[PDB]
Amino acid sequence: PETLEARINRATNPLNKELDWASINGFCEQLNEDFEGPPLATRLLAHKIQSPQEWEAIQALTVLETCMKSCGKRFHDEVGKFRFLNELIKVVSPKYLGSRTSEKVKNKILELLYSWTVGLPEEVKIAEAYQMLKKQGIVK
Amino acid sequence: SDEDLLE
């Protein structure tokens, strides 16, 4: 099959005129198949999501969203670690990257975290990360 | 086995 890299690179190409579901859904399929799929996926996603190129970052979030809905407990657990969530917090927070990221990207992330605290209540670290952003008045 | 929560 195609590697996670090859998948994610197609799925988030800033050259895409529209969303590439073959690549997006193939990424999810592939991380679910591979033993160390989920931890690699989460590393590749964080980087893409932190891109200065908005359409790369927005596509990457769409991948994140998609696979969170379709996969996981292995995937759900990787995303529910601070190792990953910190990279999101960096994006949405003025202290860090927040000042040079669009409202669109940051609002998308905040939305996603919320949706997770509700659909995945056992992933208590996501809720920790969300309540921390709320207490700081980032949410929203 | 995990980072600390980033404040």
Curated annotation (Swiss-Prot), chain A:
PTM description: Phosphorylated by CK2 and dephosphorylated by PP2A. Phosphorylation of GGA1 allows the internal DXXLL motif to bind the VHS domain and to inhibit the recognition of cargo signals. Ubiquitinated.
**Which part of the chain is the VHS domain?**
11-140
Compartment(s) where it occurs, according to its Swiss-Prot or TrEMBL record: Golgi apparatus, trans-Golgi network membrane; Endosome membrane; Early endosome membrane
Please list the tissues where expression of this protein has been recorded. Ubiquitously expressed.
Q: Which family does it belong to?
A: Belongs to the GGA protein family.
Job of this protein: Plays a role in protein sorting and trafficking between the trans-Golgi network (TGN) and endosomes. Mediates the ARF-dependent recruitment of clathrin to the TGN and binds ubiquitinated proteins and membrane cargo molecules with a cytosolic acidic cluster-dileucine (DXXLL) motif. Mediates export of the GPCR receptor ADRA2B to the cell surface. Required for targeting PKD1:PKD2 complex from the trans-Golgi network to the cilium membrane. Regulates retrograde transport of proteins such as phosphorylated form of BACE1 from endosomes to the trans-Golgi network.
| Subunit field text | Monomer. Interacts with GGA2 and GGA3. Binds to clathrin and activated ARFs, including ARF1, ARF5 and ARF6. Interacts with RABEP1. Interacts with RABGEF1. Interacts with the type-I membrane proteins LRP3, M6PR/CD-MPR and IGF2R/CI-MPR. Interacts (via N-terminal VHS domain) with SORL1/sorLA and SORT1 (via C-terminal cytosolic domain). Interacts with EPN4. Interacts with CCDC91. Interacts with HEATR5B/p200a. Interacts with SYNRG/gamma-synergin. Interacts (via GAE doamin) with NECAP1 and NECAP2. Interacts (via GAE domain) with AFTPH/aftiphilin. Interacts with TSG101 and UBC. Interacts with RNF11.
Q: What is this protein called?
A: ADP-ribosylation factor-binding protein GGA1
Q: Which organism is it from?
A: Homo sapiens
Q: Which gene encodes it?
A: GGA1
Swiss-Prot record, chain B:
Renumbered to this chain, motif DXXLL motif involved in the interaction with GGA1 spans 2-6
Q: Which residues carry this modification: Phosphoserine?
A: S1
Where does this one sit in the cell?
Golgi apparatus, Golgi stack membrane; Endosome membrane; Endoplasmic reticulum membrane; Nucleus membrane
* Function per UniProt: Functions as a sorting receptor in the Golgi compartment and as a clearance receptor on the cell surface. Required for protein transport from the Golgi apparatus to the lysosomes by a pathway that is independent of the mannose-6-phosphate receptor (M6PR). Lysosomal proteins bind specifically to the receptor in the Golgi apparatus and the resulting receptor-ligand complex is transported to an acidic prelysosomal compartment where the low pH mediates the dissociation of the complex.
Q: Which disease is it linked to?
A: A common polymorphism located in a non-coding region between CELSR2 and PSRC1 alters a CEBP transcription factor binding site and is responsible for changes in hepatic expression of SORT1. Altered SORT1 expression in liver affects low density lipoprotein cholesterol levels in plasma and is associated with susceptibility to myocardial infarction.
Domain text from the record?
A: The N-terminal propeptide may facilitate precursor transport within the Golgi stack. Intrachain binding of the N-terminal propeptide and the extracellular domain may also inhibit premature ligand binding. The extracellular domain may be shed following protease cleavage in some cell types.
Q: Which family does it belong to?
A: Belongs to the VPS10-related sortilin family. SORT1 subfamily.
Name the record gives this protein: Sortilin
Q: Which organism is it from?
A: Homo sapiens (Human)
